[PDB]
């Protein structure tokens, strides 16, 4: 019942932000603020009333809330939304990141701020629709609709220091990657629907009806391959990853745009929700390939992050390595590894958001991103280098933060299933500590390597400090008490794992 409003409140809020711009330039930021406040409040109300801790595992499908309304009845297509623990957790995370993105773009007094807020709101609504839709056409529709405002933000509001050609190139590369992968997913969806229609005789795009589809070994592999190509593009999985550092480099300089849609949290949800239940045998056969791709992703992202002269590109490759960890966790069939993947996903979202906000604040301080042009910034600033130190400590998997908790449940479950990939991934953890310390040493330690870092810098504002400290508190609480998060998603993870291991 509240799921259509969970999707529509960002869209209506973005329309109001665009239309109420004639009342002033400081008006749409407030409208976006109560828009994401209402979205996050609805998500938290669903969390409180769902009773997710007391929910047992009853097998797929098992939805805590559902909504169904016909959209294209010729193909059996409906606006079909459903929420359980995993989707609710990701909707809560998306709403929190939307609140932080509205807060981070508070000082932008641009002439077209209303359209910026509309694009941000539509990206967030598309992400929530990705997390809520259990109709294959609707899921694909949200998965592709979250790309046009992202493209226009990167292309027209982007990194003003770089040329417009570089921003247009990065935005076009991101759009081509995501849309071509989505078209491959749409081909897989259409073939699955047609196979189900040939087997039974009913036009349906419903995820619940497509779970039981009699399929030959080789057609299921192809459909799983199409789904995996889409998710692997947006995971990112090597070699389909470079769009992410190019999009992070040429994103708008506020940093809110980095938290809005470029943070990856939908592809692993799609892998857990759709790739494993719809194609369990094909995923079981593809598991060595995906796990070795995750190993290569971890090592390649770590070596990429160490070899970066740009801090934003370094954080992007950190995201690549962490998502390789999550990809290893997904193709294991372990409940412990799945819960660790959920915790790692939430913790990576929080820590990457903190790192991107701090990098943006550093960029409005010193007007450069080259780590060769900065150094010894610990003595020049008040709050920023210590918070960046904490977030770099978080991203290397230090205990006390949720990143360690998630990645260590991942490695526990993986070693219960596969030992060799687990030990190579833990050497990837060594590599993670290496690049985190390298970025810390090149950015805030040493002497001033240029003249812009030689003089004192203005302190961070109270609002940016408050939201960064909120991220710090959330990461520490997730590290020291992840139990509410583990209890929220225990039923959905159990259903997905039981379907994956009881059908192979």
């Amino acid at each position: 019942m509240l799921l259509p409003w969970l999707i529509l409140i960002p869209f209506i809020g973005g329309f109001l932000c665009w239309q109420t711009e004639r009342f002033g330039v400081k008006v749409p930021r407030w409208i976006a603020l109560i828009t994401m406040g209402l979205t996050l409040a609805l998500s938290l109300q669903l969390w409180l009333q769902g009773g997710y801790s007391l929910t047992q595992s009853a097998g797929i499908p098992q939805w805590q809330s559902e909504f169904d309304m016909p959209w294209i009845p010729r193909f059996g297509i409906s606006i079909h939304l459903a929420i359980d623990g995993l989707s609710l957790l990701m909707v809560v995370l998306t709403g929190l990141l939307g609140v932080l993105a509205v807060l981070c773009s508070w000082k932008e007094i641009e002439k077209y701020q209303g359209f910026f807020h509309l694009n941000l709101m539509w990206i967030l609504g598309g992400v929530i629709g990705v997390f809520l839709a259990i109709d294959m056409f609707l899921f694909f529709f949200f998965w592709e609709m979250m790309l046009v405002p992202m493209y226009f933000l990167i292309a027209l509001w982007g990194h003003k220091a770089s040329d417009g050609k570089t921003r247009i190139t990065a935005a076009t590369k991101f759009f081509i990657y995501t849309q071509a992968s989505g078209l491959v997913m749409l081909i897989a969806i259409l073939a699955l629907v047609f196979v189900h229609y040939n087997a039974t005789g009913v036009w349906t795009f419903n995820y619940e009806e497509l779970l039981n589809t009699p399929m030959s070994s080789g057609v299921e592999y192809l459909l799983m391959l199409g789904f995996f190509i889409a998710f692997a593009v947006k995971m990112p999985v090597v070699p389909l990853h470079g769009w992410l550092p190019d999009a992070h480099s040429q994103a708008p300089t506020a940093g809110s745009v980095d938290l809005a849609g470029i943070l990856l949290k939908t592809a692993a949800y799609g892998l857990l929700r759709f790739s494993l239940p719809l194609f369990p045998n094909a995923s079981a056969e593809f598991a060595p390939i995906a796990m070795w791709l995750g190993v290569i992703g971890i090592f390649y992202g770590a070596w990429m992050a160490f070899a970066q002269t740009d801090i934003k590109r370094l954080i992007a490759y950190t995201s690549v390595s962490h998502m390789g960890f999550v990809l290893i966790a997904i193709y294991t069939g372990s409940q412990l590894a799945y819960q660790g993947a959920v915790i790692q996903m939430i913790a990576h979202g929080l820590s990457a958001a903190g790192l991107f906000i701090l990098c943006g604040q550093l960029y409005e301080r010193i007007h450069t991103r080259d780590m060769r042009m900065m150094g010894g910034l610990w003595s020049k600033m008040k709050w920023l280098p210590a918070l960046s130190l904490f977030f770099a400590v978080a991203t290397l998997g230090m205990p006390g933060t949720g990143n360690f908790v998630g990645e260590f449940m991942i490695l526990f479950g993986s070693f219960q299933v596969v030992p060799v990939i687990t030990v190579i991934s833990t050497f990837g953890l060594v590599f993670a500590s290496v690049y985190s310390l390298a970025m810390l040493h090149r950015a805030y330690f040493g002497k001033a390597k240029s003249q812009i870092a030689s003089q004192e810098l203005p302190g961070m504002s109270l609002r940016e400090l408050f939201m960064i400290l909120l991220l710090v508190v959330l990461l520490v609480l997730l590290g020291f008490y992840p139990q509410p998060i583990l209890d929220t998603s225990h039923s959905a993870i159990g259903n997905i794992q039981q379907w994956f291991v009881n059908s192979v």
């Binding site: 230090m398 006390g400 225990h490």
Partner: protein, 598 residues
């Protein structure tokens, strides 16, 4: 003793307050907060020990909450306290309080005063978590926090890039050790189904009755983690470079917290090592080899802090040898005594480096016994305790207990290694003392505790660690006589070599094998060069090779192919009408031929 968690909370409160103060407070207020946090932790530790001895030495458990409960994976946030935990906690809190008071006197007028005390408070809290944990994951949290605070404190003077490089090397080597420890954790949870020490000891013999390979793998990985943290073979290379930090940082690392974590890890999981005797013999062999290499390296070091680093490595090798010969009580007693005299030696070396006012090697200094008599006395008694001076030093009794454990378990080669290491220990220690010195309440407390007064304190390890095999009285007496004779002979040989005019020493040093051996042992037997060539250089080369992102270009190859194909196809649009008619007729020919063929 229900306030067992206050020993963590008070250093945590101090760390949070001194971090969020950001140095805006006065130095008196920051010193009060930090030293008072550690002192309140030490006072709560003393009350805990009083209640522990009043209750008859009962293992107490305080479960705060549950960390993570996913199916059978149940990891709890529970603190435990037995004799070993009480001994480690008392050593950590007391020596940390003494070092905190000395640092409050020492670091006056230095930028980052509050940051320094916050980092040391977090260090103390992390090690109290390490020594109070009841399972391996909470001990891993304390382990990694101890490593993180070591990184933050070694590179404290962040302006010098050498300190940052030293801190990064220390963190990377200890992170490799923590990865080995994580392997041990994964194997132990996969086999036994739990990470609590008591439960792992209980269900280890019932589970490994059929096969006993994964337990040797787990104990080998535990040994790898221990030698990662305790700076032993083969992960010992970080300590000498990590000497770039401040003096109280060095005292807190080498004496109280950092290097003793591996010894505590081996002593805590002693049952699993008891069921894997080959791994325990490997622990003893690693300790013997590490103490021998550390003594040989300390023989030729030209700096006081480097000599103290390799002396710390040699002493930790003695502890590992004691653990390998099933002399657990000897190992923990030597941990206490070594913490005492190594803290005293490091604080005295900091006094020396304040008096000298410049970074100088030991040869430039000379005749310092008259300018600083109190510092000379502190160095003399710290060297006497380190070199195991008989009947006046606690290190003598600790080393005698270690060697008696080596006797009583039938280990002869480890005994020979221990005696040789004691001989060169006296040799390098009094070599440093005679080169440097010839040519205050924490100091008083460590002055007293480095003597036999420290040997009067015994750890209450009965009922926690197994009691050692008992040596005969005559064998014990002749072993004590041999140890004292070896130590006295080494000290007298150092006096014959370095007290007078150096002619025999310089003749050995000026020999060509003298150059070869001095350069070999000065660089820690080439292990640093070996790890630079085998690991650091290919890492840098692969990073430089991959910095262009080859996979991105490989996936951009279709865009280049599309551009080339479009440019090739646009040549047909030359705008000539006759060519358009010719192309239409060519297509007619192709369509007709294709229809005729098919």
């Amino acid at each position: 003793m229900n306030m067992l968690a206050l020993t963590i909370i008070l250093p945590l409160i101090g760390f949070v307050l001194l971090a969020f103060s950001r140095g805006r407070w006065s130095e008196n207020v920051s010193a009060i907060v930090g030293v008072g946090s550690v002192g309140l932790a030490a006072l709560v530790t003393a009350f805990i020990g009083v209640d522990f001895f009043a209750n008859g030495e009962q293992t107490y458990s305080q479960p705060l909450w549950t960390w993570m409960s996913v199916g059978d994976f149940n990891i709890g946030f529970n603190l435990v306290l037995d004799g070993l935990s009480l001994t480690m906690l008392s050593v950590v809190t007391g020596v940390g309080f003494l070092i905190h008071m000395y640092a409050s006197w020492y670091m006056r007028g230095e930028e980052g005063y509050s940051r320094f005390f916050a980092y040391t408070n977090l260090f103390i809290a992390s090690m109290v978590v390490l020594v109070l944990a009841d399972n391996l994951l909470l001990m891993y949290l304390g382990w990694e926090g101890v490593g993180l605070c070591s990184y933050l404190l070694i590179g404290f003077y962040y302006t010098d890039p050498k300190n940052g490089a030293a801190a990064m090397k220390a963190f990377v080597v200890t992170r490799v050790g923590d990865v080995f420890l994580a392997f041990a954790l994964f194997i132990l949870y996969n086999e036994l189904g739990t990470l609590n020490f008591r439960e792992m000891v209980e269900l280890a013999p019932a589970h490994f009755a059929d096969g006993n390979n994964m337990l040797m793998w787990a104990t080998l990985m535990l040994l790898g983690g221990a030698v990662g943290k305790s700076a032993q073979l083969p992960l010992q290379t970080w300590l000498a470079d990590a000497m770039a930090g401040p003096t109280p940082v060095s005292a807190l690392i080498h004496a109280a917290t950092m290097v003793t974590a591996g010894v505590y890890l081996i002593a805590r999981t002693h049952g699993l090592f008891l069921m894997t005797p080959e791994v325990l013999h490997l622990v003893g062999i690693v300790g013997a080899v590490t103490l021998l290499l550390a003594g040989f390296a300390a023989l030729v070091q030209t700096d006081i802090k480097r000599v103290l680093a390799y002396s710390t490595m040699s002493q930790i090798g003695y502890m590992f040898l004691a653990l390998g010969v099933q002399a657990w009580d000897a190992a923990i007693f030597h941990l206490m005594t070594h913490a005492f005299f190594k803290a005293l030696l490091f604080l005295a070396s900091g006094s020396v480096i304040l008096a000298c006012h410049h970074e100088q090697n030991i040869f430039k200094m000379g005749g310092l016994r008259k300018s600083i008599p109190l510092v000379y006395l502190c160095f003399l008694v710290g060297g006497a305790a380190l070199s195991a001076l008989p009947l006046v030093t606690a290190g003598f009794f600790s080393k005698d207990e270690i060697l008696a454990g080596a006797m009583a378990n039938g280990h002869i080669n480890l005994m020979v290694a221990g005696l040789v290491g004691a001989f060169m220990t006296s040799l390098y220690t009094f070599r440093m003392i005679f080169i440097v010195f010839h040519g205050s309440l924490p100091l008083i407390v460590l002055l007293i505790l480095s003597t036999f007064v420290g040997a009067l304190i015994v750890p209450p390890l009965q009922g926690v660690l197994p009691q050692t095999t008992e040596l005969a009285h005559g064998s014990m007496l002749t072993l004590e006589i041999t140890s004292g004779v070896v130590a006295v002979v080494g000290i007298l040989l150092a006096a014959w070599l370095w007290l007078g005019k150096r002619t025999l020493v310089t003749s050995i040093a000026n020999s060509a094998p003298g150059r070869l051996l001095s350069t070999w042992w000065y660089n820690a037997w080439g292990f640093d060069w070996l790890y630079d060539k085998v690991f650091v250089k290919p890492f840098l080369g692969i990073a430089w090779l991959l910095k262009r992102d080859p996979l991105n270009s490989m996936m951009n190859i279709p865009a280049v192919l599309s551009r080339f194909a479009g440019k090739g196809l646009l040549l047909s649009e030359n705008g000539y009408l006759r060519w358009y008619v010719a192309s239409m007729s060519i297509g007619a020919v192709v369509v007709l031929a294709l229809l005729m063929v098919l």
